[PDB]
Design a protein around this ligand. Structure first.
Ligand SMILES: Nc1ccn([C@@H]2O[C@H](COP(=O)(O)OP(=O)(O)OP(=O)(O)O)[C@@H](O)[C@H]2O)c(=O)n1
Ligand SMILES: Nc1ccn([C@@H]2O[C@H](COP(=O)(O)OP(=O)(O)OP(=O)(O)O)[C@@H](O)[C@H]2O)c(=O)n1
Ligand SMILES: [Mg+2]
Ligand SMILES: [Mg+2]
Length: 330
């Protein structure tokens, strides 16, 4: 392996988090929550003199897709799980259904919170986000997620067509073998970049989902095959330079009539239902700051290439990737 490739592979080793299938801890913490949901629904529904609805859980998010990273000191693990309740969506309000889940987890961990798109339960060092779905068998074949907050109007409480497994398939299937490894490594690099240079639980923070979907559209492998030996070498720095430049190229200056100015906006559609712009909640100013840091990271990746000293090349990247990017002495 070439010098800088070695440093990127070490970085990847430091930031990577084992996926559900390879991580006893995540499964046990996930299962602790799923049990406290089953236990809690018995109490809730018996209280109401009915039988508890049942549910099928399924792994979701980066922990299901092998694109998870370790948080920086003071951050939390983000344990994503779907639950398919044995109900017909047309018999029930979506927020009422998320209320069941909230009520069931009342006393567990550090309390539960109905978010727009999940119920989140808190533990020291991690949160589980429960995406709550109706039975497609009882709901007309489509899998629909419970959207809405308690404090949200009729228009904003809906059952929306969802395809998390379709998304997981799309991320798993785009490439194979060492090509798909480089894709996953590069998604992780940008998640640590997000964590280092952006604010946690700030919309300003370009979501993992968005960088994942950007990679789906625009990631390109960077490798070389030796003409004579057929030996293959990967260039994660070059893969990241092409990918970041492509993202930057896809921003469009978008007039805002309210502010009487333009903001650069990057649109990234989910490639499965509901095909929404995953970055649609980011403001114009948050989009402006996103583009500027994306550009400074591009400028770093190019500078890294032309440095004579491994030390200076690695320092330029660590300015963007944080203190776990290895910097050898000069
Ligand atoms: N706007 C969104 C947000 C989330 N999801 C779905 O919910 C999952 C969990 O979302 P999130 O935890 O935000 O993303 P991850 O892909 O897990 O990324 P990260 O590692 O940064 O948490 C996504 O993978 C996706 O299947 C979605 O469809 N649309
Ligand atoms: N289709 C989706 C959308 C979101 N999520 C979960 O919810 C989170 C993203 O929520 P988001 O829609 O970005 O929240 P807001 O609309 O900002 O909601 P609120 O104002 O309640 O915070 C992710 O971590 C993921 O676990 C999901 O599982 N599936
Ligand atoms: Mg996640
Ligand atoms: Mg989450």
């Amino acid at each position: 392996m070439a010098p800088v490739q070695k440093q990127f592979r070490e970085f990847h080793d430091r930031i990577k988090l084992a996926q559900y299938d390879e991580n006893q801890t995540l499964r046990d913490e996930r299962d602790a929550v799923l049990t406290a949901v089953r236990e809690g629904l018995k109490k809730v529904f018996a209280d109401r003199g009915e039988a508890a609805p049942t549910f099928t859980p399924f792994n979701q998010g980066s922990y299901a897709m092998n694109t998870g990273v370790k948080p920086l000191e003071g951050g939390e693990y983000d344990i994503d799980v779907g639950i398919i309740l044995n109900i017909a969506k047309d018999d029930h309000d979506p927020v009422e259904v998320k209320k069941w889940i909230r009520d069931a987890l009342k006393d567990y961990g550090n309390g539960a919170e109905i978010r727009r798109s999940c119920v989140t339960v808190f533990k020291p060092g991690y949160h589980v986000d429960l995406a709550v779905y109706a039975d497609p068998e009882l709901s007309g074949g489509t899998l629909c997620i419970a959207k809405g907050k308690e404090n949200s109007g009729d228009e904003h409480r809906l059952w929306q067509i969802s395809d998390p497994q379709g998304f997981q398939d799309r991320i798993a299937s785009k490439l194979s073998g060492d090509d798909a490894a480089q894709f996953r490594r590069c998604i992780r690099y940008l998640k640590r970049w997000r964590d280092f240079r952006f604010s946690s639980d700030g919309n300003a923070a370009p979501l993992g989902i968005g960088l994942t979907a950007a990679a789906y559209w625009w990631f390109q492998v960077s490798k070389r095959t030796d003409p004579v030996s057929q030996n293959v070498t990967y260039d994660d720095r070059d893969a990241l330079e092409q990918f970041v430049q492509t993202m930057l190229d896809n921003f469009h200056d978008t007039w805002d009539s309210k502010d009487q100015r333009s903001y650069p906006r990057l649109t990234v559609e989910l490639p499965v239902q509901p095909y929404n712009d995953v970055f649609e909640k980011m403001t114009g100013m948050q989009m402006e700051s996103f583009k500027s840091k994306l550009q400074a990271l591009l400028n770093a990746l190019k500078t890294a290439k032309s440095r004579l000293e491994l030390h200076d090349a690695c320092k330029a990247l660590a300015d963007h990737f944080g203190s776990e990017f290895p910097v050898p002495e000069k």
